[PDB]
Motif scaffolding. Structure first.
Motif, short mmCIF file in Angstrom:
data_model
loop_
_atom_site.label_atom_id
_atom_site.label_comp_id
_atom_site.label_asym_id
_atom_site.label_seq_id
_atom_site.Cartn_x
_atom_site.Cartn_y
_atom_site.Cartn_z
N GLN A 23 0.92 -1.23 0.02
CA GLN A 23 -0.01 -0.12 -0.13
C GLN A 23 0.82 1.36 -0.01
N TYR A 24 2.03 1.32 0.87
CA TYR A 24 2.75 2.29 0.93
C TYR A 24 3.47 2.56 -0.60
N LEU A 25 3.90 1.58 -1.18
CA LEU A 25 4.40 1.51 -2.74
C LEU A 25 3.53 2.00 -3.52
N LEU A 26 2.46 2.07 -3.36
CA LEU A 26 1.26 2.59 -4.33
C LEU A 26 1.25 4.12 -3.90
N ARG A 27 0.73 4.22 -2.60
CA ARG A 27 0.27 5.46 -2.09
C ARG A 27 1.47 6.45 -1.84
N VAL A 28 2.55 6.22 -1.62
CA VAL A 28 3.51 7.08 -1.60
C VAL A 28 4.55 6.71 -2.52
N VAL A 29 5.24 5.75 -2.81
CA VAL A 29 6.21 5.65 -4.04
C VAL A 29 6.14 5.99 -5.35
N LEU A 30 4.92 5.14 -5.69
CA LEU A 30 4.49 5.46 -7.18
C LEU A 30 3.70 6.76 -7.41
N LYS A 31 2.95 6.95 -6.43
CA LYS A 31 2.21 8.33 -6.63
C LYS A 31 3.41 9.58 -6.55
N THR A 32 4.29 9.23 -5.76
CA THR A 32 5.30 10.57 -5.85
C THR A 32 6.01 10.56 -7.17
N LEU A 33 6.71 9.46 -7.41
CA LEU A 33 7.21 9.21 -8.68
C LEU A 33 6.47 9.87 -10.01
N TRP A 34 5.17 9.31 -10.04
CA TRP A 34 4.27 9.48 -11.17
C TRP A 34 4.15 10.86 -11.51
N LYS A 35 3.83 11.80 -10.43
CA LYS A 35 3.50 13.17 -10.54
C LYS A 35 4.76 14.18 -10.80
N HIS A 36 5.91 13.56 -10.89
CA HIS A 36 7.04 14.19 -10.95
C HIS A 36 7.08 14.89 -12.48
N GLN A 37 7.77 15.96 -12.55
CA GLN A 37 8.05 16.69 -14.11
C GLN A 37 8.83 15.89 -15.21
N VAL A 106 18.77 9.73 -18.89
CA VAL A 106 19.44 9.50 -17.54
C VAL A 106 19.44 10.43 -16.22
N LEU A 107 19.74 11.82 -16.48
CA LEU A 107 19.29 12.84 -15.57
C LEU A 107 17.66 12.59 -14.99
N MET A 108 16.96 12.37 -15.82
CA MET A 108 15.39 12.06 -15.64
C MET A 108 15.28 10.93 -14.62
N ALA A 109 15.99 9.83 -14.79
CA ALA A 109 16.06 8.65 -14.05
C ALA A 109 16.61 9.00 -12.89
N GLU A 110 17.60 9.54 -12.81
CA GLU A 110 18.40 9.87 -11.63
C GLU A 110 17.52 10.54 -10.76
N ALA A 111 17.04 11.80 -11.03
CA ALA A 111 16.19 12.42 -10.09
C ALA A 111 14.85 11.63 -9.56
N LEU A 112 14.44 10.81 -10.43
CA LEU A 112 13.35 9.77 -9.91
C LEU A 112 13.96 8.93 -8.89
N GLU A 113 14.79 8.60 -9.36
CA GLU A 113 15.61 7.38 -8.30
C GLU A 113 16.06 7.94 -7.07
N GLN A 118 14.78 7.69 -1.10
CA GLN A 118 14.27 8.52 0.17
C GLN A 118 12.99 7.79 0.55
N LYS A 119 12.10 7.45 -0.18
CA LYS A 119 10.74 6.94 0.15
C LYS A 119 11.08 5.53 0.55
N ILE A 120 11.85 4.74 0.02
CA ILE A 120 11.74 3.32 0.18
C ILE A 120 12.86 3.19 1.59
N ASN A 121 13.57 4.37 1.98
CA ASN A 121 14.34 4.28 3.07
C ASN A 121 13.33 4.50 4.44
N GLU A 122 12.18 4.73 4.14
CA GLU A 122 11.16 4.63 5.22
C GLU A 122 10.21 3.76 5.05
#
Ligand SMILES: CCc1cc2c(n1Cc1ccccc1)CCCC2=O
Length: 127
Positions: A23-37, A106-113, A118-122
């Motif tokens: 649930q965290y992977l969906l609500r926090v991790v995926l949602k955070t990356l998905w909305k990113h520029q 690659v710069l884009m991937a690095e920003a998302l990563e 940071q999210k997976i740390n918690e």
């Protein structure tokens, strides 16, 4: 030219769970990356035909993208969080394998990563 079939997102005989970590992977991790520029190139499988990358699937044999991950999470495809975390890492790794240091993608991937890490740390403890 031709794209391969996409990764599986549905498999009724695969055992499934809905856990607080998933649930965290969906609500926090995926949602955070998905909305990113910088999310947009990663929101669907790499279209090697449209992008004129005929060697992409010669080099990348384990494709992954956030569109696929989103479908897997929404359709409760996973048994555990590590499966999903592996999918994100596959997506990033593929990008670094195929492309060159400092390339826009690659710069884009690095920003998302960075955000991913940071999210997976918690990641919450189970139950
Ligand atoms: C060699 C071009 C390329 C490589 C790749 C992508 N493109 C297209 C693209 C590049 C930069 C920014 C947005 C899309 C997007 C999908 C993932 C990928 O590795």
């Amino acid at each position: 030219s031709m794209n391969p079939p996409p990764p599986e997102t549905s498999n009724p005989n695969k055992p499934k769970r809905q856990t607080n970590q998933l649930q965290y992977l969906l609500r926090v991790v995926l949602k955070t990356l998905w909305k990113h520029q910088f999310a947009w190139p990663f929101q669907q499988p790499v279209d090697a035909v449209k992008l004129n990358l005929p060697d992409y699937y010669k080099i990348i044999k384990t494709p992954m993208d956030m569109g696929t991950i989103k479908k897997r999470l929404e359709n409760n495809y996973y048994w555990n969080a590590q499966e999903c975390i592996q999918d994100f890492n596959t997506m990033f790794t593929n990008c670094y394998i195929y492309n060159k240091p400092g390339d826009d993608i690659v710069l884009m991937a690095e920003a998302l990563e960075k955000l991913f890490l940071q999210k997976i740390n918690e990641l919450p403890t189970e139950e």
